């Protein structure tokens, strides 16, 4: 019973992240392994006004970028798999994620490759006055 969830078209994709124990390099090899992306990220909507900090309680966006959800942005939690998080789960579950226009195709590799900087709270390089 319950509620439906995943697309059968990306089944294989999540399959590679369901049975993997080195799932990070695994799924980046998958993004680069003869496939098209995980075509199901929650699509938010905002006025595109505010600072660039994606990790926000209520969408805090720029004119260029675009917001998806907070939770639907970590494959470690997108696949209900175990985590290497020390204690003991992933943070972005609960907020929002406003990714800048370029790299905003898939937020999984984004959340895993980049991570928020403590100075400006934005994604490191998009942009920052970090020297």
């Amino acid at each position: 019973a319950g509620n439906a969830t995943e697309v059968p078209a990306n089944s294989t994709v999540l399959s590679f992240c369901a049975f993997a124990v080195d799932a990070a390099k695994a799924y980046k090899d998958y993004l680069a392994s003869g496939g098209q992306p995980i075509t199901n990220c929650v699509k938010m909507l905002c006025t595109h006004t505010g600072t660039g900090q994606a990790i926000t309680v209520t969408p805090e966006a720029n004119m260029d970028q675009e917001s998806f959800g907070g939770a639907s942005c970590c494959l470690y939690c997108r696949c209900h798999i175990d985590h290497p998080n020390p204690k003991g789960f992933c943070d972005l579950k609960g907020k929002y994620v406003q990714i800048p226009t370029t790299c905003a195709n898939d937020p999984v590799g984004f959340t895993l490759k980049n991570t928020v900087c403590t100075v400006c709270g934005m994604w490191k390089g998009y942009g920052c006055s970090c020297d």
């Binding site: 019973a1 319950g2 509620n3 439906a4 969830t5 995943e6 697309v7 059968p8 089944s11 294989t12 999540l14 399959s15 590679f16 369901a18 049975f19 993997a20 124990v21 080195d22 799932a23 390099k25 695994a26 090899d29 998958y30 392994s33 003869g34 496939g35 199901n40 990220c41 929650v42 699509k43 938010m44 909507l45 905002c46 209520t58 969408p59 959800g69 907070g70 939770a71 639907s72 970590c74 470690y76 939690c77 997108r78 209900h80 175990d82 985590h83 003991g88 789960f89 992933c90 579950k93 609960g94 907020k95 929002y96």
Partner: protein, 523 residues
């Protein structure tokens, strides 16, 4: 189109505040207005929801070389025996809080085992998933009444995977550096596997040279199978898809096709053992193939050389004894003479001739009701042929199948599968084969001069203490040494004994006798 893959399992239908739902479908219709989601301050987010989630609909088949595609195709699982072991699991659904998920309860393989385990599952939580234990009940089907006493006595996952990888590490440790499974209905195995299994990069085992099929999570260590003790994961295993290889009905009635000896005591391991059995049939009940080899594990060349030398020796003895006018060979694939010098009428027969020298190998399928009253003249040859009743005269050697030999791998239907270099699907043993002869009587035959300083005849040849009146290797009267002969019998004795460790049994007809060799030696 929606998935049973990751399909929610609890009855609560209230959608998730999409900041707590990792997919664009698990959002309630309060946020989706023209395909877009709008943040709502009118209600805060929720922190009270503990729902298990389905783990079906996988169909794992990425395409990279950095992982080897675990599922092996038609041949790559037929070629590689010493790895075949069953895989099947029984499952159930929950009662109150949720339902709609499949979870394992008893696991059976080819090994005569059926593991008990309490059910647990991935409950969804506002922070991640938890691995929670939920009330369980078998399906309402009455044939699951046998499954009643299993839910209140099972086991968690940690100890279970330790014991399972250790059953592996003592039963399959003797066999292969991976592990392949037969499977009929692939689907429930797909659903059941995930709990103590993980994919990733196959690498190199810890302090060993095998491929790493073990994995730790507390340390991330990689064990083979002589070194998996408390290290509880199967990492790069294999399987063999039995179902999609020419079948129609279920595996039970298709076992009833040929495999009849397999009774049906109500267990679960029977399903996987019969999966292996029927996969064995639907590829190997036909003719033995000569293009397939195997690793040798082990000591096999000793058995091979002993078999060759003893076969040649016994044929030589029977020939030089009975003086056969004609020796009708049967089932010899390479047209060379076993005994080097034999003035006997030499033929060539088989149920399947070849190309060249088929002018030797005549077309004939023997049978006891057919060819019974023809080859009475001379004698035939029934070395490792597995037909019906042996005729009145024959030099025979049949694999007594019930023996213990860890290269024996049981199959269908009771008829054993011996794993040498060519896989022998040999028919089982019964008494109805040898009802015209008697088992092998011992002897020892030699017809060559000595090595000592005498050169000529008795008495100038050295006799050292050898006292045995059964090694008819004349000269023999209290000494019987001749150096080269005596010690050879020594070695030869070893030879004979070694054969009774394989399974091959030798029998020679009743009217054989010992004094013909004595009179042969009266020079």
């Amino acid at each position: 189109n929606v998935t049973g893959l990751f399909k929610d399992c609890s009855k609560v239908i209230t959608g998730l505040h999409p900041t707590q739902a990792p997919t664009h479908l698990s959002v309630d219709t309060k946020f989706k207005t023209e395909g877009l989601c709008v943040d709502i301050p009118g209600i805060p987010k929720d922190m009270t929801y503990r729902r298990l989630i389905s783990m079906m609909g996988f169909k794992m088949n990425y395409q990279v070389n950095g992982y080897p595609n675990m599922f092996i195709t038609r041949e790559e699982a037929i070629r590689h025996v010493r790895a075949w072991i069953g895989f099947d699991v029984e499952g159930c659904h929950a009662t109150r809080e949720a339902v709609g998920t499949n979870l394992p309860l008893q696991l059976g393989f080819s090994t005569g085992v059926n593991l008990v385990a309490v059910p647990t599952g991935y409950v969804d939580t506002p922070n991640n998933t938890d691995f929670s234990r939920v009330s369980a009940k078998p399906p309402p089907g009455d044939q699951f009444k046998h499954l009643i006493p299993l839910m209140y006595k099972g086991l968690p996952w940690n100890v279970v995977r330790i014991k399972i990888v250790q059953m592996l590490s003592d039963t399959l440790k003797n066999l292969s550096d991976r592990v392949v499974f037969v499977l009929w209905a692939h689907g429930f195995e797909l659903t059941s596997m995930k709990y103590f299994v993980k994919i990733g990069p196959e690498r190199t085992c810890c302090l060993c040279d095998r491929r790493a099929t073990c994995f730790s999570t507390a340390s991330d260590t990689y064990a083979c199978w002589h070194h998996s003790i408390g290290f509880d994961y199967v990492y790069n295993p294999f399987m063999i898809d039995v179902q999609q290889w020419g079948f129609t009905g279920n595996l039970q009635s298709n076992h009833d096709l040929y495999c009849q000896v397999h009774g049906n005591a109500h267990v679960a391991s029977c399903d996987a053992i019969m999966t292996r059995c029927l996969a064995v049939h639907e590829c190997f009940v036909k003719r033995v193939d000569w293009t397939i080899e195997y690793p040798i594990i082990g000591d096999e060349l000793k058995i091979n050389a002993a078999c060759r030398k003893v076969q040649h020796m016994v044929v030589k003895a029977a020939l030089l004894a009975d003086k056969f006018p004609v020796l009708h060979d049967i089932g010899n694939p390479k047209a060379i003479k076993c005994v080097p010098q034999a003035d006997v009428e030499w033929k060539f027969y088989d149920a399947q001739p070849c190309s060249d020298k088929a002018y030797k190998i005549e077309e004939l399928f023997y049978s006891y009701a057919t060819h019974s009253d023809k080859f009475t003249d001379g004698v035939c040859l029934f070395w490792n042929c597995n037909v019906d009743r042996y005729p009145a005269n024959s030099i025979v050697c049949r694999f007594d199948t019930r023996v213990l030999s860890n290269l024996n791998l049981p199959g269908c239907d009771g008829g054993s599968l011996y794993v040498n270099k060519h896989a022998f699907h040999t028919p089982a043993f019964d008494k109805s084969a040898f009802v015209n002869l008697k088992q092998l009587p011992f002897f020892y035959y030699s017809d060559s001069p000595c090595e000592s300083h005498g050169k000529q005849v008795v008495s100038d040849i050295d006799y050292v203490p050898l006292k045995s009146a059964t090694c008819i290797t004349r000269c023999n009267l209290g000494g019987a040494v001749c150096r080269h002969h005596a010690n050879e019998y020594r070695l030869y004795l070893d030879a004979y004994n070694m054969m009774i460790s394989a399974g091959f049994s030798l029998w020679v007809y009743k009217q054989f006798d010992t004094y013909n060799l004595w009179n042969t030696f009266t020079r």
